[PDB]
Amino acid sequence: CLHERQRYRGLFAALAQTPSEEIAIVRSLSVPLVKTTPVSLPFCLDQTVADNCLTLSGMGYYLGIGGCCPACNAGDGRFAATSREALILAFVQQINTIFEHRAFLASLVVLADRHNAPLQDLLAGILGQPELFFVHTILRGGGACDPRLLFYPDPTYGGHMLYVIFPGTSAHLHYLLIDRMLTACPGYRFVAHVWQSTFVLVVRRNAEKPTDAEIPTVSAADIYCKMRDISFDGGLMLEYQRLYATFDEFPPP
Amino acid sequence: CLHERQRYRGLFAALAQTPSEEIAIVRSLSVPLVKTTPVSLPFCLDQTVADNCLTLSGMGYYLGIGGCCPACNAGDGRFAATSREALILAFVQQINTIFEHRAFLASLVVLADRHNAPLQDLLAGILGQPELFFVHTILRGGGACDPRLLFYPDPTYGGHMLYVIFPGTSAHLHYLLIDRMLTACPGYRFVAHVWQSTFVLVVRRNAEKPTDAEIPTVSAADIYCKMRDISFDGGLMLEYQRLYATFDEFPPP
Amino acid sequence: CLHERQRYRGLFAALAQTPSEEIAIVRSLSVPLVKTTPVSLPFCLDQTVADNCLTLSGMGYYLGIGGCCPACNAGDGRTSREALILAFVQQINTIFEHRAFLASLVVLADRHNAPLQDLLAGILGQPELFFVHTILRGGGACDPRLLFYPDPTYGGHMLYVIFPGTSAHLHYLLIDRMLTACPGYRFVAHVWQSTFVLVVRRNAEKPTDAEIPTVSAADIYCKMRDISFDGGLMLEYQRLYATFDEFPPP
Amino acid sequence: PAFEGLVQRIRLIVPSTLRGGDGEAGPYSPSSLPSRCAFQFHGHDGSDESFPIEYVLRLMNDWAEVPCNPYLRIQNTGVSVLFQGFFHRPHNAPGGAITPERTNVILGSTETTGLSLGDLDTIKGRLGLDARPMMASMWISCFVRMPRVQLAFRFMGPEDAGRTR
Amino acid sequence: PAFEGLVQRIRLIVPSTLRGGDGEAGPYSPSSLPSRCAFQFHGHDGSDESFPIEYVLRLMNDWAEVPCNPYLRIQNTGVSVLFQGFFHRPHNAPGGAITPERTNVILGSTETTGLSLGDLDTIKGRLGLDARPMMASMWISCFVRMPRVQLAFRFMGPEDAGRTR
Ligand SMILES: [Zn+2]
Ligand SMILES: [Zn+2]
Ligand SMILES: [Zn+2]
């Protein structure tokens, strides 16, 4: 490290005489020379520091500085109503907003019919893990990259783990989006993977963190009745049947 | 390394003719040049020699010479040293000093409600191992510093381990305090650790009960009734409930 | 070995010319320059040669040539299996000579609430312990204490010789007679709770013929019931058992 | 030849949010270097702050006139992130825990990491970044969200060209 | 040229609480060094005293005019701590202070430890302490309790100026 000391001693000495220029120069060193970092699937989001977005596409699996990647800078406005409390409010208000969060309920109906199980018990079991609904709510451009959701029994401890299916050949997860996903549900692990040329984000349990201390009670029977009263789109049901049939043989990462 | 010691040999020879100056020099070398020693948690207090204090804080986990450490040099007024006899006296007279041991009993009540169990048998079982009460008495400090205490079942052994919860972002264990803790409770091991950004001291059974068996018997029914007539502060009970809920998922070190 | 050969050739030749002086010189080399050898506990007495004594103390754990240990040289007064067998048989008449043994047995009977008749029968079944007791209770000794604890693996009762004080010097004659009198028993020195101890356990199965006469346990039991023991000794044995109740046998 | 001058300069270069600056190394001269941290910074929960590691390490190497390898150590501790600066590589601490294509690093409770100036220069050379003075300086962007501390070792560059002769 | 002079000087240097010395000092010449401890000190129950190891080892090297590596050994025997001073390695453990980050050491019944002068110099250099004569001497602070004996290798310094040239 002597060559560094040689070619830097003059510069450091000249900077010592004027601390103002030194502070200015060091503060001027805020231009990332490495914006894209290579990632390798399967990839767990726990290794994603804040200010990091995930661009999984045919052009590669890579992480990007949230400040320089274009799509992150061109957000969807001030959708900063992603507080844990507001998510709890949405979880409790599911009964009157059945028309939104349609993918969740349609996936539940499709799973209940595919496995010949009761829909009320399935609703109670999925509602016991509101973190999955929170993940669904965050990822909601409501069509704008509206991720699909599959529910499969969870090995080890757990009622049902979740598979967030990203439609298309690409998936860009915003850095704020990933941060809020990791913070709102801490005890659940997120692992990105690909199956049959379809990108997926697997959500499984990692500790007892259902927050039964602050978990609101929502009636599952009322949601069941409102679901039985509303007719779902045949396209969504057929798409969920196909997605379940394709992902029925998927090794969980 | 010979001739350095020879360049000290010349000095030793010149000094040998006058032993008085030699003894003076040797006695004058009493200022430790290494005051702070880095430690890494988990750390067992058995490795703490006398005249050694433990400073766990955001600025690091470090051990300090008890004689030079500033807070140690202030000594908190010394507070003398609880003799083993006086500790036994406190264990027996606990019934009449219910306020002096309020945190202990409040933790017991909170646990009794937490496991929907009776309080009298739990009190009798916890008092059967008075070393935890001894630790409570030793680390008791006037003012806020008055440490909190949680009780958890002990695996791989027969009884109940203790969690001394220190409030705040810093914890300084005095050398006299830890030394007297280790001497008064010989059969129990003390290990410092961190959980949910909170410093904790875990006290468990060690060395297969090398403890006096002549400990006197205290009636649990009388203390149970004295608890039944005294109403505890809701704030302390709620704090103990929160601490128990947070530490219910704590890997015992 | 060229240096040694050249520097010794002259002396060896000069001695070859006079064998008498050679024998004198060789026999004159009888002054050990290394008297103390360091040992480390746990230490088994089998590695102690006949002429080696053990001075386990705070100033070190060291073995010494039986010819040089000072107290050994003052061990002028101070024998084998024979007298030990005679004493074992006459135990009924010498309760005062063996008070520590029987008093420890009574205290042990109270510690485990077991019957004294069965304890007496079991302890007399292992006469090597009585032999060790007799050996260690020398003339003007410091009566080393004796505890009895059940023996795992091999079945019976092992012995804990408790040495009082902060030091323990085992005479070479004592060690030799202990190892010869009890061939099937292993002796291991150790320290527990700042107290030096000698553990005697069963070894090599049953390499101990039964040439020992039969001693009645009922008569000894009755004579013990008739003799009143001195207060404090029972409390001392209770304390020793309570302290050594948590001792991993080495 | 001012030991405290170096600490003051480093404190100036490091942002203000990183509370610290203590010596904890005792009197040390450019010739005699200590084995204790020359500077000690710390951040609280939510300290989404940046640390100029390359600048401080190169400055430490500059001030000292004896061959050395300045080194930084990062500890998630239990309640706050802790940065320590040693003049020579410590022992019992992971050396090169920053490998290329591994800019992101996470630290749980009581966990530690670090980096030496030699490893920093080698990684800078491997990436092929501009080795000219002040054309590529490493920055540690740290987000302390308890129980974890998430670090990103990103090479940031200048915005102009300045004076170059 | 004093066979007993070295042990007498060491006895002068060692505090009084460490009752011992004048023992196990096998016949030894300044040229011919023994494999037995030149001095043997011991302390009783409850002794909380310090031992100047560096001074004693440097004095041992002083008396001998042949290359050597003075060595100290500390053994808990269950009833008293014993310090022994060998002129050459007794084939025991190198030390506990060999790891600058493990200055504290505990010894149960029959346990042993030690340190050589080479290891002392290595730790002194690693810590970067002042190498001037009598500016940094290691001290063994020993606390003798009933089961265990707890020793601490602390580098203590002078309080004034040697008054030397
Ligand atoms: Zn982006
Ligand atoms: Zn302190
Ligand atoms: Zn002897």
Which residues in chain D touch residue E126, judged by CB atoms under 8 angstroms apart?
35
Q: Which of B244, B247, B249, B250 should one mutate to test binding to chain A, selecting the residue with the greatest count of A CBs within 10 A?
A: B249
Q: E139 and B29: CB-CB below 8 Å?
A: yes
- Token pair listed for D9: 């300069």
- Chain E interface residues (partner C, CB cutoff 8 A): 20, 23-24, 40, 42, 44-45, 75, 77-80, 82, 109-110, 146-147
Residue with tokens 């000087």: E9
- Token pair listed for C53: 């004594």
Q: D80 and B58: CB-CB below 8 Å?
A: yes
Residue with tokens 């005890």: A187
Three-class DSSP category at E42: strand
| In chain C, alpha helices (H) | 2-17, 19-27, 70-73, 81-90, 99-111, 116-124, 127-136, 172-181, 217-226, 233-244
Q: E134 and B13: CB-CB below 8 Å?
A: no
C-alpha angle D29-D34-D39 in degrees, rounded to nearest 5: 90
A42 preceded by a cis bond (ω within 30 of 0):
yes
Residue with tokens 């050491």: E105
CA distance E63 to C233: 54
Ligand nearest to the CA of C52: 3
- What region does D23 belong to: left with phi over 0, alpha with psi -120 to 50, or beta? alpha
CA dihedral C83→C84→C88→C94, nearest 10 degrees, is 70
Evaluated on CA atoms C100, C106, C109, C114, the torsion sign reads positive
| D28 part of contact set with chain E, CB < 8 Å | yes
Non-local CB neighbours of B24 within 8 Å, separated by 6+ positions: none
CA distance B182 to B187: 9
Q: B249 and A208: CB-CB below 8 Å?
A: yes
- Token pair listed for E50: 């310090």
CA distance B105 to B108: 5
Non-local CB neighbours of B172 within 8 Å, separated by 6+ positions: B53, B54, B55, B56, B71
Q: A29 and D67: CB-CB below 8 Å?
A: no
The residue type of B38 is: P
Q: Which of D35, D36, D68 should one mutate to test binding to chain E, selecting the residue with the greatest count of E CBs within 10 A?
A: D35
Interface partners of chain D (CB pairs < 8 Å, 3 or more) are A, B, E
Bridge partner list, C159: C148, C200
Q: B58 and D147: CB-CB below 8 Å?
A: no
- Token pair listed for E143: 């606390």
Q: How many other C-beta atoms lie within 10 A of the C-beta of residue A143? A: 6
Q: Which string of DSSP letters, residue by residue, matches chain B?
A: -HHHHHHHHHHHHHHHT-HHHHHHHHHT--EES--EEE--SSEEGGG--SSEEEEEETTEEEEEETTT-HHHHHGGG------HHHHHHHHHHGGG-TTTTHHHHHHHHHHHHHTT--HHHHHHHHHTSTHHHHHHHHH--SSTT--EEEEEE-TTSSSEEEEEEPPSSEEEE-HHHHHHHHHH-TTEEEEEEEETTEEEEEEEE-SS--S-S-PPP--HHHHHHHHHHSPPPHHHHHHHHHHHHHHTT----
- Chain C interface residues (partner E, CB cutoff 8 A): 36, 40-41, 57-61, 166, 191-194, 196
| B213 part of contact set with chain C, CB < 8 Å | yes
Non-local CB neighbours of D163 within 8 Å, separated by 6+ positions: none
Q: How many other C-beta atoms lie within 10 A of the C-beta of residue A71? A: 11
CA distance B117 to B108: 11
CA distance E40 to C36: 14
CA distance A36 to D154: 11
Q: What is the DSSP letter of A163?
A: E
CA distance D114 to D74: 6
Q: Tell me the CB-side half-sphere exposure of residue B243, using CA atoms within 13 A.
A: 27
At A210, which helix (H) or strand (E)? none
| A249 part of contact set with chain B, CB < 8 Å | no
Say how many Å lie between the CA of residue A74 and the centre of ligand 1: 9
| In chain E, alpha helices (H) | 3-13, 53-63, 117-126
Non-local CB neighbours of E26 within 8 Å, separated by 6+ positions: E34, E36, E38
Say how many Å lie between the CA of residue A31 and the centre of ligand 1: 16
Three-class DSSP category at A204: strand
Kindly state the greatest CA–CA separation across chain D.
48
The side-by-side arrangement of strands in the sheet containing A36-38 is A36-38, A60-65, A52-57, A170-173
Burial C112-130 (b: 16+ CB within 10 A, else e): eeeebeebbebbbebbbbb
Burial C175-208 (b: 16+ CB within 10 A, else e): bbbbbebbebbbbbbbbbbbbbbbbbbbbeeeeb
CA distance B150 to B159: 14
- Tell me the technique behind this structure: X-ray
Which residues in chain C touch residue B215, judged by CB atoms under 8 angstroms apart?
none
Residue D147: phi and psi, rounded to 5, are -75, 0
CA distance D3 to chain E (A): 15
Pairing of strands E71-76, D148-157: unpaired
Give the closest residue to B201 by CA, choosing from E108, D78, E148: D78
Q: D101 and A7: CB-CB below 8 Å?
A: no
Which residues in chain D touch residue E128, judged by CB atoms under 8 angstroms apart?
28, 32-36
- Token pair listed for E153: 């290798």
CA distance B43 to B178: 13
Which residues in chain B touch residue C246, judged by CB atoms under 8 angstroms apart?
208-210
D136 and D129 Cβ atoms separated by less than 8 Å:
yes
CA distance E161 to D101: 54
- Token pair listed for D20: 């610290």
Identify the burial level of B34 via C-beta atoms within 10 angstroms of its C-beta, where 0-12 means exposed, 13-18 middle and 19 or more buried: buried
CA distances from residue A249 to A149, A195, A238 in whole angstroms, order as listed: 16, 10, 18
CA distances from residue E158 to B24, B27, E129, E136, E155 in whole angstroms, order as listed: 11, 9, 12, 7, 10
